[PDB]
Design a protein around this ligand. Sequence first.
Ligand SMILES: O=C(O)C1=C(C(=O)Nc2sc3c(c2-c2nc(C4CC4)no2)CCCC3)CCOC1
Length: 134
Amino acid sequence: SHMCDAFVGTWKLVSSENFDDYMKEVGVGFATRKVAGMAKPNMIISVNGDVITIKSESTFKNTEISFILGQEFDEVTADDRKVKSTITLDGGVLVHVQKWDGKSTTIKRKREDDKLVVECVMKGVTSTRVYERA
Ligand SMILES: O=C(O)C1=C(C(=O)Nc2sc3c(c2-c2nc(C4CC4)no2)CCCC3)CCOC1
């Protein structure tokens, strides 16, 4: 009955490219990058009314955000940055912008064939992470 229906469900990580470089660009330190790079998270996406919830579950750490499209919220990220986030839908793509200390990074999620493709961009550096249904 809505746009976001194509995203809903439980997803598992199947491939990752350039994720160590993207994390260096964001400022993540060595030990966190090593543990993050080894993670094989599940991503669980659900909708209730106007509220969308995205859960990332892994061996080390579970994180979860709930939000309304276009309404800014405060978020603590898995590497413990405190950021201001806004998530919108742009032409069928979920676009998550995070701002902290004069910096910005964007995470886009798109459905492509049977995959949910996550593209993370900071300055010049892009990491692509591909998920399939669990
Ligand atoms: O869900 C995804 O595929 C995305 C990300 C992701 O899985 N990150 C994980 S899983 C995870 C950890 C981290 C982590 N990210 C960071 C910085 C880069 C943001 N520091 O630690 C650390 C603890 C163990 C499990 C991040 C980028 O956006 C999409």
